[PDB]
């Protein structure tokens, strides 16, 4: 031990965008998230409850139109995506909270 | 017509952006700003300016001859 043992500095969340346009690939991937709180924070439970309500979808789930989650449901019926998933990633005192999805070039807007 | 997603084909071009609530709307405004307006003016004077002065001159000359003509000494 002794000297040479540093701690972890916080990491500023910025909130911006990076787009890697490539029309050669057949399906768009998008990942959007707000800054979440870190591991310690008690409010991760409520965030996960909220995320569970939105849930996840994929084009091989049985039950389409009848799924509880409105996003899931509207995604399956109007075929606005191939898959999507909400996430709540945690780090020391920060995190990425939001969702990720995959879809045809003409569905990125409706999906969002 | 035209839409978004049917415009054209683009490949391998990344675009970084930053949210408007995280940057200044007027960064080096006077600093970087003014030199730019001077540079734009330089680039364009020789094409904008001359035609106009040609009129500017035609205008003042045109008026002098007119005014000076409605006068006369002998005959």
CA distances from B54 to A34, A97, B51, B59 (A): 61, 66, 5, 9
SS3 state at A39: coil
| Total count of domains within chain B | 1
> Sign of the CA dihedral B38, B42, B44, B49?
positive
SS3 state at A98: strand
CA distances from A82 to A1, A104, B6 (A): 51, 8, 20
Which of B11, B16, B19 is the closest to A23 by Cβ?
Answer: B11
> Could you tell me which of A77, A40, A13 has the C-alpha nearest to residue B22?
A13
Q: How far apart are CA A55 and CA A35, in angstroms?
A: 19
- Specify the experimental method: X-ray
- DSSP letter, residue A65: T
Q: How far apart are CA A1 and CA B10, in angstroms?
A: 54
SS3 state at A86: strand
Residue with tokens 């540093």: A6
Q: How far apart are CA A29 and CA A103, in angstroms?
A: 7
Preferred mutation among B6, B15, B21 to probe A, highest tally of A CBs within 10 A: B15
Which of B10, B14, B15 is the closest to A23 by Cβ?
Answer: B10
Half-sphere exposure (CA, 13 Å, Cβ side) for A83? 10
User: What resolution does the deposited structure have, in angstroms?
Assistant: 2.6
Q: How many CB atoms sit inside 10 A of residue A83's CB?
A: 17
Structure tokens at A46: 């409520």
CATH code of residue B65: 1.20.5.210
Spell out the residues 6+ positions from residue A97 whose beta carbon is closer than 8 angstroms to its own.
Answer: A33, A34, A35, A36, A47, A51, A87, A88, A89
Q: Which domain holds residue B54?
A: 1-75
Residue A75, classified by CB atoms within 10 Å of its CB into exposed (0-12), middle (13-18) or buried (19+), is buried
Q: How far apart are CA A59 and CA A75, in angstroms?
A: 9
Q: How many CB atoms sit inside 10 A of residue A90's CB?
A: 17
Q: How far apart are CA A102 and CA A58, in angstroms?
A: 9
Long-range contacts from A9-14, C-beta under 8 angstroms, 24+ separation: A10/A92, A10/A93, A10/A94, A11/A91, A11/A92, A11/A94, A13/A94, A14/B18, A14/B19, A14/B22
Nearest CA in chain A to B14: A20
């Amino acid at each position: 031990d002794e000297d040479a043992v540093p701690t972890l500095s916080p990491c500023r969340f910025t909130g911006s965008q990076i787009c890697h346009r490539e029309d050669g690939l057949p399906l768009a991937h998008v990942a959007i998230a707000v800054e979440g709180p870190g591991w310690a924070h008690p409010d991760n439970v409520a965030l996960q409850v909220a995320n569970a309500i939105i849930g996840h979808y994929d084009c091989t789930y049985g039950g389409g139109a009848h799924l509880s989650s409105p996003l899931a449901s509207i995604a399956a019926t109007n075929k606005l995506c191939q898959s999507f998933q909400t996430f709540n990633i945690c780090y020391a005192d920060t995190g990425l909270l939001g969702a990720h999805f995959v879809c045809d070039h003409m569905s990125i807007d409706d999906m969002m | 017509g035209r839409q978004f997603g049917h415009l054209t084909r683009v490949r391998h071009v990344i675009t970084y952006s930053l949210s408007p609530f995280e940057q200044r709307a007027f960064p080096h405004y006077f600093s970087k700003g003014i030199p730019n307006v001077l540079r734009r003016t330089r680039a364009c004077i020789l094409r904008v300016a001359p035609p106009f002065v040609a009129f500017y001159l035609v205008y003042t000359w045109g008026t002098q001859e007119f005014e000076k003509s409605k006068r006369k000494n002998p005959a």
